[PDB]
């Protein structure tokens, strides 16, 4: 659950590569690798509290798609439900088709 609620960006797995030596393109004999290990790369997840209808709604999104939250907030049309307006603001209003 470290996944963007809007873009669906979720942590990926990537290698940390320890290289040493002078580049070849700088008259070095070339680079050498002293280790390769796995690590996660998490999306830059942040909270976005935004007031909709009468309720406060909180999105967990990548900083990158924060704009999308407020665009999803513009679309307004009758909905006095529970703290679950996002259920409606969500994919219901994302791409739908």
């Amino acid at each position: 659950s470290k996944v963007c609620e809007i873009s669906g960006k979720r942590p990926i797995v990537a290698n940390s590569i320890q290289r040493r030596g002078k580049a070849k393109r700088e008259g070095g004999v070339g680079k050498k690798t002293t280790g390769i290990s796995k690590r996660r790369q998490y999306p830059n997840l942040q909270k976005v509290r935004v007031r909709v209808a009468g309720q406060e709604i909180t999105f967990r999104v990548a900083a990158s798609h924060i704009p999308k939250v407020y665009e999803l907030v513009e679309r307004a049309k009758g909905l006095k439900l529970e703290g679950l307006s996002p259920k409606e603001i969500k994919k219901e209003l994302l791409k739908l088709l």
């Binding site: 007031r51 924060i66 407020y70 665009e71 513009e74």
Partner: protein, 146 residues
């Protein structure tokens, strides 16, 4: 980022000036405080619609005077009063100049705000002025007898 202001500020513009600012400012201050809204393609469209609405129902209000200015600024009404001599027993008020014109040429006016200041006594040829905004000077003759 560009937003549409919904109020004068000092620090930005006023009531409709599309001005860009830090998205942080927008998200955590303006928008939440109704202080403004985002320059959406929609919101921007609806703003032009906003501007045209006024500019129309406004340039129409001026097209109401410039019209009622012409039918009035040249035609003259007569006020026959128990004048005695150069000093009316009664007095023609703005309220009167109204009723008069309503038949003497058949139009309606204020009758308030007419630059009336104090009911007019005595006789002669008077030139007053009217409204609203860029206006018209009405001419009228206070006479004598019935």
């Amino acid at each position: 980022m560009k937003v549409i202001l919904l109020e004068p500020l000092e620090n930005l513009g006023d009531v409709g000036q599309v001005v860009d600012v830090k998205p942080g400012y927008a998200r955590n201050y303006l928008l939440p405080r109704g202080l403004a809204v985002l320059a959406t393609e929609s919101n921007l469209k609806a703003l032009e619609a906003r501007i045209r609405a006024q500019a129309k129902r406004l340039a129409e209000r001026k097209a109401e005077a410039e019209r009622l200015k012409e039918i009035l600024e040249n035609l003259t009404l007569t006020i026959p009063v128990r004048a005695g001599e150069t000093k009316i027993y009664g007095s023609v008020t703005a309220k009167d100049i109204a009723e008069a014109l309503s038949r003497q040429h058949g139009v309606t006016i204020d009758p308030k705000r007419l630059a009336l200041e104090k009911p007019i006594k005595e006789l002669g040829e008077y030139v007053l002025t009217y409204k609203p905004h860029p206006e018209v000077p009405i001419q009228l003759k206070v006479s004598v007898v019935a």
